[PDB]
Amino acid sequence: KLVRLPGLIDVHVHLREPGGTHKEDFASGTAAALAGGITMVCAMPNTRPPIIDAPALALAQKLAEAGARCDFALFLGASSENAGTLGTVAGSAAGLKLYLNETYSELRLDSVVQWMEHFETWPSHLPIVAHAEQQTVAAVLMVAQLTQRSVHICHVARKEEILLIKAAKARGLPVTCEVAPHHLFLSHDDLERLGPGKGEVRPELGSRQDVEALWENMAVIDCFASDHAPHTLEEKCGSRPPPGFPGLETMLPLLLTAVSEGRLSLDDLLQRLHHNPRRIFHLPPQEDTYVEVDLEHEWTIPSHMPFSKAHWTPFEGQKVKGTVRRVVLRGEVAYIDGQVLVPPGYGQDVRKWPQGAVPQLP
Amino acid sequence: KLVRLPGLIDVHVHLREPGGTHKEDFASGTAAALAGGITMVCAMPNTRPPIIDAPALALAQKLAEAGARCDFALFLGASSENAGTLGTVAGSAAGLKLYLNETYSELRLDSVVQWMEHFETWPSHLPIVAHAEQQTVAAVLMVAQLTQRSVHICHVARKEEILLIKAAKARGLPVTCEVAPHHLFLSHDDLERLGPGKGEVRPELGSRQDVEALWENMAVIDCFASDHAPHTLEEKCGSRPPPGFPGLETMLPLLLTAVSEGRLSLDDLLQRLHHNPRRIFHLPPQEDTYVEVDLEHEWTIPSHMPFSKAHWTPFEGQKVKGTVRRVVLRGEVAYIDGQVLVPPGYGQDVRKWPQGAVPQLP
Ligand SMILES: NC(=O)N[C@@H](CC(=O)O)C(=O)O
Ligand SMILES: NC(=O)N[C@@H](CC(=O)O)C(=O)O
Ligand SMILES: [Zn+2]
Ligand SMILES: [Zn+2]
Ligand SMILES: [Zn+2]
Ligand SMILES: [Zn+2]
Ligand SMILES: [Zn+2]
Ligand SMILES: [Zn+2]
């Protein structure tokens, strides 16, 4: 007896095209998405070249339209030079991404004044998401208040961060956040096994107390999102390991396991992988789209999942209960039992659909 | 023809007693204050032991009462363990100091939640000052808003910081700030001469653009304060140089030079070294107290000033115009032309004066 879920949405993925296609491309990363029960992804802009201007966005849009197997939206990235220049194309993007700490990106902003300039110039009705760790969460919240608008905090990983956001929500401030599976299911206790190269990720893995604080404060978490950040094993195990974990194929099985154990409800899961992504990013419905899962199947995560070109996973060896059996995307069978059955290019840019534009005053 | 000034107040000094008395003690640091035309100092809590609990404050109070030559108030320091424990003694302190970045202190707080706990537990009518650099300024401002109270930002040094504070003031937020003389009169252009050891200070010396932004935004600066941070030449030139500059004896001559050049007015100076310190920290008047300065005397700062045990200065070689000729403190001649004439112990804790308590609702 399968359970039918709506088309799930991952608002934080790195698909590496253009410029890092040995790590992943649109075709491989969206195959991984479908195998993970995800039918729509929002792709981050820290590619090579980065998606920080109109020509780069135009290129990325065409590469995605030609390679994507599921539907998508593309983020623009904030840079030290592009505030005030993105107005014509802003509404075609998922939103604007700010990189406010050291991570796998060349887009760090060097002054809070540059953050203010982005918050002041980016259209006020369109999403802004921030990579903002520890005190940076409080700093970007201040900038959002000074500019009188909302912000969404990416990959919250620490007790400190979730409690700050909790306090902000208690004061009625317009802040939402997302949490990635590695910060719910891995901790410092796993760094022995992972090693210092594989274990590199931003935000770094938290303590057991961080993990327990995120679960305890599930009500404060608006979305789950994988931060699928594929890098090859050679890169993760080499001298200058880039941070990040692949995660599209493992996210839903990990969370279904938690549902089966009573750690959160099916509704809690669907708010965080469907309804809240839709409403925060104004992402449109997908007609005739659903995911069928088998909640009874017990399996052990292997050393690599079938589709991501990362060809490794930090969840290797974890026992899960729950698997994706079938995905239907816009009336076509997209995935069955380990086989992706829609070709590269089946996926569409949801921001071009009439229902996918963000509403705005004239 | 001398000019009579009121008793000037430095709200940010390190007098090193207890525990670092080779760098400075109450007697030597307050002699330096008097020679710099300063009649009241607020001493920071990063001593050894640090002033982070009632017994340490009691000791420091007695050492100051016995050694100080000018009047004073003593800050308490926030620690990772003392939130909620300072209520009985809080009103006897200048205020509470938070160390939110790496600097010469063991008091760094490791989580914004600890900042929130201090803002929630410290009595709401009493001052809070923060060492908060770059984005940390925005972060502590957010914490202040969440807790619905004011904050004072220590040693603002960068264009980024002064513009953030400017934006906060434009939104009506209760924030004040101070700037130290080295961030108005030294820059990266001076690191060649100073060297990497002497030049170590927190916040670090800024660019010419940082310095010009502070001057351009003088209206945003509420106070000048020296951040007199004496360390010996051996320490500054050694393998692990501590950050900080001595500055009590040079602050007023540097600023008088700027007044003579029309860079700010005498009133601008007196707001920032007298009236605003009084009103932000609720520091009492000093009866029969004044400073006589000679605005015409041109001199070159030497390799060390007479009184601070630091026995060095980063302003060596700068030409100044303006000198302190006489200080009268509470009816006694305290300083004339290079000689301090009040003994250790003449100075008093202003928080014990009836007029020196911070007003509060019953
Ligand atoms: N999280 C990571 O460790 N890496 C991400 C970048 C990011 O989300 O900050 C990546 O693109 O590799
Ligand atoms: N500013 C510094 O560089 N040093 C100060 C500490 C401080 O004010 O942060 C000190 O106590 O030495
Ligand atoms: Zn990130
Ligand atoms: Zn995100
Ligand atoms: Zn990411
Ligand atoms: Zn400081
Ligand atoms: Zn200060
Ligand atoms: Zn200081």
Tab-separated table of N, CA, C and O in Angstrom, chain A residues 158-222:
chain	number	residue	atom	x	y	z
A	158	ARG	N	22.227	25.290	13.844
A	158	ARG	CA	22.684	25.401	15.214
A	158	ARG	C	21.541	25.798	16.133
A	158	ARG	O	20.632	26.544	15.747
A	159	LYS	N	21.648	25.340	17.388
A	159	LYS	CA	20.755	25.806	18.449
A	159	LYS	C	20.718	27.329	18.505
A	159	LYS	O	19.652	27.937	18.580
A	160	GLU	N	21.883	27.966	18.446
A	160	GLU	CA	21.955	29.421	18.489
A	160	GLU	C	21.091	30.061	17.417
A	160	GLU	O	20.387	31.051	17.670
A	161	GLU	N	21.148	29.515	16.208
A	161	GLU	CA	20.456	30.104	15.074
A	161	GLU	C	18.956	29.893	15.176
A	161	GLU	O	18.178	30.825	14.945
A	162	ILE	N	18.523	28.669	15.483
A	162	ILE	CA	17.084	28.417	15.539
A	162	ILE	C	16.446	29.178	16.694
A	162	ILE	O	15.313	29.636	16.579
A	163	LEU	N	17.159	29.360	17.810
A	163	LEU	CA	16.587	30.135	18.907
A	163	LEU	C	16.527	31.621	18.595
A	163	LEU	O	15.595	32.309	19.033
A	164	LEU	N	17.505	32.149	17.860
A	164	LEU	CA	17.422	33.527	17.411
A	164	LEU	C	16.218	33.724	16.498
A	164	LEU	O	15.443	34.671	16.665
A	165	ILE	N	16.041	32.826	15.527
A	165	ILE	CA	14.896	32.944	14.626
A	165	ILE	C	13.590	32.810	15.397
A	165	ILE	O	12.612	33.510	15.114
A	166	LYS	N	13.544	31.885	16.360
A	166	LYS	CA	12.370	31.726	17.206
A	166	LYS	C	12.026	33.035	17.910
A	166	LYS	O	10.856	33.427	17.991
A	167	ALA	N	13.040	33.705	18.465
A	167	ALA	CA	12.815	34.967	19.159
A	167	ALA	C	12.324	36.030	18.196
A	167	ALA	O	11.450	36.845	18.528
A	168	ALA	N	12.863	36.039	16.982
A	168	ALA	CA	12.411	36.998	15.977
A	168	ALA	C	10.962	36.751	15.588
A	168	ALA	O	10.177	37.703	15.468
A	169	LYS	N	10.579	35.482	15.431
A	169	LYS	CA	9.193	35.184	15.090
A	169	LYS	C	8.259	35.583	16.225
A	169	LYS	O	7.131	36.027	15.976
A	170	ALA	N	8.708	35.417	17.474
A	170	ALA	CA	7.892	35.809	18.620
A	170	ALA	C	7.642	37.307	18.631
A	170	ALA	O	6.639	37.752	19.203
A	171	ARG	N	8.557	38.100	18.067
A	171	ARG	CA	8.396	39.538	17.919
A	171	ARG	C	7.662	39.912	16.633
A	171	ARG	O	7.570	41.102	16.303
A	172	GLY	N	7.123	38.928	15.915
A	172	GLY	CA	6.386	39.191	14.697
A	172	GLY	C	7.196	39.592	13.489
A	172	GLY	O	6.640	40.172	12.561
A	173	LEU	N	8.497	39.335	13.480
A	173	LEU	CA	9.316	39.764	12.362
A	173	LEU	C	9.147	38.800	11.185
A	173	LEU	O	8.992	37.593	11.377
A	174	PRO	N	9.211	39.317	9.956
A	174	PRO	CA	8.976	38.471	8.785
A	174	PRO	C	10.254	37.752	8.382
A	174	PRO	O	11.036	38.210	7.536
A	175	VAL	N	10.474	36.629	9.022
A	175	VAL	CA	11.613	35.767	8.743
A	175	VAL	C	11.116	34.332	8.620
A	175	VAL	O	10.286	33.881	9.415
A	176	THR	N	11.607	33.617	7.612
A	176	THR	CA	11.385	32.185	7.485
A	176	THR	C	12.743	31.506	7.400
A	176	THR	O	13.770	32.158	7.218
A	177	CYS	N	12.748	30.181	7.519
A	177	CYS	CA	14.011	29.472	7.462
A	177	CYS	C	13.809	28.052	6.948
A	177	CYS	O	12.696	27.526	6.881
A	178	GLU	N	14.918	27.439	6.590
A	178	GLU	CA	14.953	26.055	6.148
A	178	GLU	C	16.080	25.330	6.862
A	178	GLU	O	17.053	25.943	7.312
A	179	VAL	N	15.933	24.014	6.945
A	179	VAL	CA	16.928	23.140	7.543
A	179	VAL	C	17.186	21.981	6.586
A	179	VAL	O	16.248	21.426	5.987
A	180	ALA	N	18.446	21.607	6.465
A	180	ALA	CA	18.873	20.532	5.594
A	180	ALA	C	18.998	19.221	6.358
A	180	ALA	O	19.232	19.205	7.574
A	181	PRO	N	18.866	18.088	5.673
A	181	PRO	CA	18.816	16.816	6.394
A	181	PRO	C	20.072	16.480	7.148
A	181	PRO	O	19.990	15.836	8.192
A	182	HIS	N	21.236	16.871	6.648
A	182	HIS	CA	22.450	16.547	7.372
A	182	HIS	C	22.508	17.217	8.737
A	182	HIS	O	23.179	16.698	9.628
A	183	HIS	N	21.800	18.320	8.937
A	183	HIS	CA	21.799	18.964	10.240
A	183	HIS	C	20.744	18.411	11.179
A	183	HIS	O	20.754	18.755	12.367
A	184	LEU	N	19.891	17.510	10.684
A	184	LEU	CA	18.939	16.768	11.507
A	184	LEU	C	19.369	15.333	11.790
A	184	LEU	O	18.887	14.737	12.757
A	185	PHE	N	20.227	14.757	10.952
A	185	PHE	CA	20.536	13.333	10.984
A	185	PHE	C	22.017	13.025	11.125
A	185	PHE	O	22.376	11.840	11.209
A	186	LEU	N	22.884	14.033	11.132
A	186	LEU	CA	24.316	13.868	11.352
A	186	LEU	C	24.755	14.900	12.379
A	186	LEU	O	24.101	15.924	12.570
A	187	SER	N	25.849	14.606	13.073
A	187	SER	CA	26.390	15.522	14.066
A	187	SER	C	27.888	15.281	14.191
A	187	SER	O	28.470	14.470	13.477
A	188	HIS	N	28.502	15.981	15.136
A	188	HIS	CA	29.900	15.730	15.459
A	188	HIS	C	30.164	14.264	15.700
A	188	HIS	O	31.281	13.803	15.477
A	189	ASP	N	29.178	13.523	16.204
A	189	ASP	CA	29.400	12.107	16.475
A	189	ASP	C	29.752	11.341	15.209
A	189	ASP	O	30.282	10.226	15.290
A	190	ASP	N	29.495	11.923	14.042
A	190	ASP	CA	29.747	11.255	12.776
A	190	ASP	C	31.056	11.681	12.110
A	190	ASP	O	31.427	11.102	11.085
A	191	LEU	N	31.775	12.670	12.658
A	191	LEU	CA	32.995	13.139	11.994
A	191	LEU	C	34.118	12.100	12.007
A	191	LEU	O	34.919	12.054	11.059
A	192	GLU	N	34.200	11.281	13.066
A	192	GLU	CA	35.102	10.135	13.092
A	192	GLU	C	34.942	9.301	11.832
A	192	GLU	O	35.917	9.012	11.124
A	193	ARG	N	33.707	8.892	11.545
A	193	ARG	CA	33.460	8.008	10.411
A	193	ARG	C	33.689	8.739	9.096
A	193	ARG	O	34.324	8.204	8.184
A	194	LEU	N	33.189	9.975	8.986
A	194	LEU	CA	33.266	10.694	7.716
A	194	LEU	C	34.703	11.068	7.370
A	194	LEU	O	35.100	11.023	6.199
A	195	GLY	N	35.490	11.448	8.364
A	195	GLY	CA	36.780	12.039	8.109
A	195	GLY	C	36.672	13.536	7.864
A	195	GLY	O	35.581	14.090	7.636
A	196	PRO	N	37.821	14.218	7.894
A	196	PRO	CA	37.816	15.688	7.813
A	196	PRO	C	37.532	16.238	6.435
A	196	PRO	O	37.149	17.412	6.333
A	197	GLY	N	37.741	15.459	5.377
A	197	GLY	CA	37.441	15.902	4.035
A	197	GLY	C	35.981	15.723	3.688
A	197	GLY	O	35.298	16.703	3.396
A	198	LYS	N	35.491	14.481	3.732
A	198	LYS	CA	34.075	14.223	3.498
A	198	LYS	C	33.213	15.064	4.423
A	198	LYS	O	32.185	15.594	4.000
A	199	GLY	N	33.629	15.222	5.684
A	199	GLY	CA	32.825	15.928	6.674
A	199	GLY	C	32.739	17.432	6.486
A	199	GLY	O	31.974	18.076	7.212
A	200	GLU	N	33.489	18.000	5.539
A	200	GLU	CA	33.464	19.441	5.311
A	200	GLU	C	32.131	19.841	4.709
A	200	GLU	O	31.762	19.380	3.623
A	201	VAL	N	31.444	20.763	5.380
A	201	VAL	CA	30.179	21.305	4.908
A	201	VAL	C	29.986	22.644	5.606
A	201	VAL	O	30.575	22.895	6.659
A	202	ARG	N	29.222	23.532	4.974
A	202	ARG	CA	28.853	24.806	5.570
A	202	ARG	C	27.336	24.935	5.590
A	202	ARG	O	26.673	24.742	4.558
A	203	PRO	N	26.742	25.259	6.723
A	203	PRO	CA	27.322	25.300	8.064
A	203	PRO	C	27.876	23.942	8.426
A	203	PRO	O	27.400	22.923	7.917
A	204	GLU	N	28.888	23.928	9.284
A	204	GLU	CA	29.506	22.669	9.674
A	204	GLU	C	28.501	21.808	10.438
A	204	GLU	O	27.475	22.296	10.935
A	205	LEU	N	28.794	20.508	10.530
A	205	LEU	CA	27.959	19.631	11.343
A	205	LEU	C	27.934	20.156	12.771
A	205	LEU	O	28.942	20.641	13.294
A	206	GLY	N	26.767	20.047	13.394
A	206	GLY	CA	26.565	20.534	14.736
A	206	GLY	C	26.789	19.469	15.780
A	206	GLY	O	27.007	18.291	15.476
A	207	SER	N	26.755	19.907	17.034
A	207	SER	CA	26.799	18.980	18.152
A	207	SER	C	25.471	18.232	18.269
A	207	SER	O	24.464	18.611	17.674
A	208	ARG	N	25.457	17.196	19.116
A	208	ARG	CA	24.195	16.537	19.441
A	208	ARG	C	23.192	17.539	19.984
A	208	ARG	O	21.992	17.411	19.747
A	209	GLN	N	23.664	18.535	20.735
A	209	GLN	CA	22.759	19.531	21.300
A	209	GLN	C	22.168	20.423	20.214
A	209	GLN	O	20.996	20.815	20.296
A	210	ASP	N	22.962	20.762	19.197
A	210	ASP	CA	22.428	21.483	18.035
A	210	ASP	C	21.333	20.664	17.349
A	210	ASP	O	20.246	21.170	17.051
A	211	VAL	N	21.609	19.390	17.069
A	211	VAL	CA	20.629	18.547	16.391
A	211	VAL	C	19.350	18.449	17.217
A	211	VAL	O	18.239	18.580	16.693
A	212	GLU	N	19.491	18.226	18.526
A	212	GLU	CA	18.320	18.095	19.378
A	212	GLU	C	17.536	19.401	19.454
A	212	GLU	O	16.306	19.376	19.588
A	213	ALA	N	18.217	20.545	19.349
A	213	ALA	CA	17.523	21.823	19.381
A	213	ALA	C	16.710	22.034	18.117
A	213	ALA	O	15.619	22.608	18.158
A	214	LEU	N	17.225	21.592	16.977
A	214	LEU	CA	16.459	21.723	15.735
A	214	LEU	C	15.191	20.884	15.798
A	214	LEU	O	14.108	21.364	15.463
A	215	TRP	N	15.298	19.629	16.258
A	215	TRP	CA	14.110	18.789	16.386
A	215	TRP	C	13.128	19.379	17.382
A	215	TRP	O	11.923	19.428	17.120
A	216	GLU	N	13.635	19.832	18.529
A	216	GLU	CA	12.787	20.394	19.570
A	216	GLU	C	12.056	21.628	19.075
A	216	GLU	O	10.946	21.924	19.534
A	217	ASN	N	12.658	22.356	18.141
A	217	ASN	CA	12.106	23.578	17.577
A	217	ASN	C	11.599	23.395	16.153
A	217	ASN	O	11.626	24.335	15.351
A	218	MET	N	11.099	22.201	15.851
A	218	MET	CA	10.547	21.936	14.530
A	218	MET	C	9.505	22.970	14.130
A	218	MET	O	9.417	23.327	12.951
A	219	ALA	N	8.730	23.486	15.097
A	219	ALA	CA	7.703	24.465	14.772
A	219	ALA	C	8.283	25.725	14.144
A	219	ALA	O	7.563	26.448	13.444
A	220	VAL	N	9.556	26.020	14.412
A	220	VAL	CA	10.214	27.210	13.889
A	220	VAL	C	10.761	26.983	12.489
A	220	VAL	O	11.064	27.951	11.782
A	221	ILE	N	10.872	25.732	12.054
A	221	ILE	CA	11.432	25.414	10.734
A	221	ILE	C	10.325	25.491	9.694
A	221	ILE	O	9.390	24.704	9.746
A	222	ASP	N	10.458	26.408	8.722
A	222	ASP	CA	9.426	26.526	7.694
A	222	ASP	C	9.575	25.508	6.573
A	222	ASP	O	8.571	24.991	6.062
